[PDB]
Design a binder for this molecule. Structure first.
Ligand SMILES: Nc1nc2c(ncn2[C@@H]2O[C@H](COP(=O)(O)CP(=O)(O)OP(=O)(O)O)[C@@H](O)[C@H]2O)c(=O)[nH]1
Ligand SMILES: Nc1nc2c(ncn2[C@@H]2O[C@H](COP(=O)(O)CP(=O)(O)OP(=O)(O)O)[C@@H](O)[C@H]2O)c(=O)[nH]1
Lengths: 405, 414
């Protein structure tokens, strides 16, 4: 019952920013850690008012970590590394990754050596970067091989379909998703344009990344809500692995939070499992649900949760191997985020997230055949053969989803 | 600390563009350019250490100026004061005079050790250099010759360091030196061999961009270098500003995003808005004449474009959707589907509260060089002006190799 959070990259670090901005007052503390329901799973005991979130903000070209420290973290565990991230996965893996992995894993095993008992890791990053992609992949590699009995969860922002912020980001995405496969037993994928449209629906003016990462932060908070807010029908990360991962390598999740508030519970539950409310733009029409976890929290009523079966027997489409009334991991938590009397999270193992994967595949299917940006990898130590086999693994995973329909 | 970048300026156009560039960058930071000292009570705006140094102290630019004639260095000192370190400024007497070989084999060899000693001094004060911006005009003599020698010596000594060149091409409206084709091709060979990137300007495009689209009946060269300076400020703001919404882009980051192939490293630049100090602004960034090179890139083929917005961002989903819609009617390489790096900077420029800079890789730029090569077809079909090239130290077969390398570049693009 302890969480070590890993934050690599600018996107992952802003996700972490918003994540603790809401997690601190979700337990009644300010952003700086001052006191204004076992909340010690995320936080280490340092001072009676300062409950320190032990999360490593390791990131090449730090830049943003300065504005992170301006909300107080543990300054010893985090590092503002010498810059030079670029958007190269190999540059975060073996060029400058090899000169930071010893220090970051010394920090990590010092953080977990003082742990009474650990459940796993929740890493927030973006697969499309160069720091959060390559450094995250290296951390996954040397963290699975160090603690094979622990359960790494990755909250990765997949690059947007409509427009791109990096010109080599599908290379990075695929060659980090391969490491997420080979090194983690759980993954929640985030898509940016879905977050933009959700925040457009939620608010009345134009949002930005801070609102998107607030939504992502609500997602991550409700992921572990049943673990740190013990009510009835508790949920654990081991339970997430057991009942959301039907096959050994199929552990990529799409997440929706509701509402977007003294709302009527049927509306909250039917809008929680809404095809347009999920935070990753995945394939719903042709896709089906493998394993949906409904984690409701706050002013939730057990009969209300269990009687909202209209949205499951009407809107939710399941695979052939799951029972019609099954496919639900139900969870109750006594505490919901503020502004919500009762709120809900849908964590779905779904076929349509493979569509997410395949769009990166599509980009890789046009770049590798044209020798597009591969010299940036070859001169950095990552050859074309390992990129090809990483894409082969990712395509096999997407085909596993397509076969699991 | 942030990844560093030194801007070495060679030749007259390079030195004057450097003067204007550090002027506008300093006044973006809130630093007086004519003095080099920070404004009291005001902190530097953004990551100063990328392009500057607190020399004890003063926020001095990390700029090296070499020119084989005293006039340009003296004029830059007059227009800039104590902004640049005099140790960074190296001058000779006779000049190169449109002769590449003086800067390559001649006074260039004599001036090389002092320039490289100063460059080693500056890089030893760098935390992590991730780019060297060579501000020069390859049409000129000193610029071409010592830019070639300097980038060759960098790649001989260093080579982990990205090199972004910012070269001013000869104008197709008029030539300023008749040996501009010689100098341009001779420096272009070493740019393809040694420089990891090259940014291309052209005076005629900036003239038509600042004549009717700046409401000046006839701009000076100061407006030319000011437009180039707005371009460079927008480009380096990614290397210069960091924060939450803004994404930090190193020059190696901008290189890895903008240079797909090792020989495909020549970039066009454009600026918006084209108004004296949104969708119409989106298209203003992407007009056929908005690029800072006398050519039409919209019949070309954008390899990859760094679109760097800077300013207040009140339409982030709307502007992302506008960029996505604009991408549909632009010529993009199929083999780079992710050909957009949408860089954001919260802080705008000083001239505008809302600006964007296009920094694109386009095949069109090659045909630009092709016309210079066409001009090279005039000076060597009859063996003209090449007596001093041969006498200064170079050889005819070497020059044929250089021209073949330029043709190899142009054929590598297309
Ligand atoms: N949905 C969100 N996307 C974000 C957020 N922050 C960044 N991004 C986007 O994620 C995408 C890539 O993430 P990053 O480049 O920041 C990951 P990283 O820092 O490791 O890249 P480098 O430092 O350049 O190596 C890009 O589109 C960013 O604009 C965010 O808070 N939410
Ligand atoms: N945008 C700007 N372009 C300039 C400026 N000065 C010159 N140029 C352009 O540079 C081109 C000529 O290159 P230069 O002679 O200035 C370079 P260099 O001093 O190395 O030549 P030599 O003295 O013959 O050795 C010409 O097209 C000019 O229009 C300037 O201040 N700004």
């Amino acid at each position: 019952r302890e969480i070590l959070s890993i934050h690599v990259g600018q996107c992952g670090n802003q996700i972490a920013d918003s994540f603790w901005r809401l997690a601190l007052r979700e337990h009644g503390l300010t952003e700086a850690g001052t006191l204004k329901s076992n909340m010690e799973v995320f936080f280490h005991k340092v001072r009676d008012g300062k409950y320190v979130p032990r999360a490593v903000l390791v990131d090449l070209e730090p830049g943003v970590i300065a504005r992170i420290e301006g909300q107080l973290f543990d300054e010893s565990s985090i590092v503002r590394k010498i810059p030079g991230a670029a958007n190269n996965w190999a540059r975060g893996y073996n060029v400058e990754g090899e000169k930071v992995i010893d220090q970051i894993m010394n920090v990590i095993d010092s953080a977990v050596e003082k742990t009474k008992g650990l459940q796993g890791f929740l890493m927030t990053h973006s697969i499309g970067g160069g720091s959060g992609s390559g450094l995250g992949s290296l951390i996954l590699e040397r963290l699975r091989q160090a603690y094979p009995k622990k359960r790494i969860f990755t909250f990765s922002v997949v690059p947007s379909p409509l427009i791109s912020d990096s010109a080599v980001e599908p290379y990075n995405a695929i060659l980090t998703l391969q490491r997420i496969l080979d090194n983690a037993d759980g993954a929640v994928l985030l898509d940016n344009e879905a977050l933009f449209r959700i925040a457009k629906a939620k608010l009345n003016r134009s949002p930005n990344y801070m609102d998107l990462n607030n939504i992502i932060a609500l997602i991550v908070s409700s992921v572990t809500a049943s673990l740190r807010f013990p009510g009835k029908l508790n949920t654990d990360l081991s339970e997430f692995v057991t009942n959301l991962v039907p096959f050994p390598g199929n552990h990529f999740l799409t997440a929706s939070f509701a509402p977007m508030v003294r709302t009527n519970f049927p509306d909250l539950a039917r809008e929680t499992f809404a095809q347009d409310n999920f935070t990753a733009a995945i394939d719903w029409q042709q896709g089906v649900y493998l394993a949906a976890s409904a984690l409701f929290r706050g002013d939730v009523k057990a009969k209300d949760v269990d009687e909202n079966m209209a949205t499951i027997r009407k809107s939710l489409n399941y695979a052939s191997y799951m029972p019609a009334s099954g496919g639900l991991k139900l969870g109750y938590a006594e505490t919901a985020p503020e502004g919500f009397a009762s709120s809900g999270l849908a964590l779905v193992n779904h076929t349509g997230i493979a569509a997410v994967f395949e769009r990166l595949i599509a980009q890789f299917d046009i770049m590798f055949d044209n020798h597009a940006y591969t010299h940036w990898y070859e001169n950095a130590g990552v050859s074309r053969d390992m990129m090809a086999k990483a894409r082969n693994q990712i395509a096999t995973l997407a085909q596993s989803y397509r076969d699991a329909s | 600390k942030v990844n560093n970048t030194i801007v070495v300026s060679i030749g007259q156009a390079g030195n004057q563009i450097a003067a204007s560039f550090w002027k506008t960058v300093c006044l973006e930071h809130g630093i007086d350019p004519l003095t080099g000292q920070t404004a009291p009570g005001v902190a530097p705006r953004g990551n100063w250490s990328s392009f500057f140094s607190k020399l004890g102290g003063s926020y001095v630019p990390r700029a090296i100026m070499v020119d084989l004639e005293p006039s340009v260095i003296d004029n830059v000192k007059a227009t800039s004061g104590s902004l640049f370190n005099p140790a960074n400024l190296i001058s000779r007497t006779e000049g190169a005079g449109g002769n590449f070989a003086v800067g390559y084999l001649g006074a260039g060899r004599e001036v090389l050790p002092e320039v490289m000693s100063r460059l080693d001094y500056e890089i030893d004060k760098c935390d992590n250099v991730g780019g060297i911006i060579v501000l020069h005009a390859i049409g000129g003599g000193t610029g071409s010759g010592f830019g070639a020698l300097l980038i060759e010596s960098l790649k001989e000594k260093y080579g982990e360091i990205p090199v972004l060149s910012c070269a001013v091409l000869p104008s197709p409206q008029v030539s300023s030196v008749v040996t501009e084709p010689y100098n341009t091709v001779f420096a272009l060979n070493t740019l393809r061999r040694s420089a990891d990137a090259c940014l291309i300007f052209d005076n005629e495009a900036l003239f038509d961009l600042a004549h009717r689209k700046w409401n000046i009946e006839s701009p000076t060269v100061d407006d030319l270098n000011l437009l180039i300076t707005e371009a460079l400020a927008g480009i380096t703001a990614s290397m210069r500003f960091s924060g939450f919404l803004t994404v930090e882009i190193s020059l190696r980051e901008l290189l890895t995003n903008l240079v797909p192939q090792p020989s495909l490293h020549f970039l066009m630049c454009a600026f918006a808005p084209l108004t004296p100090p949104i969708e119409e602004m989106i298209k203003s960034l992407f007009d056929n004449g908005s690029v800072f090179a006398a050519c039409s890139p919209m019949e070309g083929r954008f390899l990859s474009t760094a679109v760097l917005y800077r300013g207040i961002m009140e339409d982030k989903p709307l502007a992302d959707a506008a960029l996505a819609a604009m991408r549909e009617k632009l010529p993009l390489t199929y083999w780079i589907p992710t050909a957009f790096k949408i860089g954001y900077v919260e802080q705008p420029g000083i001239s505008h509260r809302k600006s964007m800079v296009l920094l694109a890789n386009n095949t069109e730029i090659a045909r630009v060089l092709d016309r210079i090569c066409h001009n090279f077809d005039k000076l060597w079909q009859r063996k003209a002006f090449a007596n001093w090239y041969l006498n200064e130290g170079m050889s005819e077969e070497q020059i044929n190799v250089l021209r073949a390398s330029a043709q190899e570049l142009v054929q590598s693009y297309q």
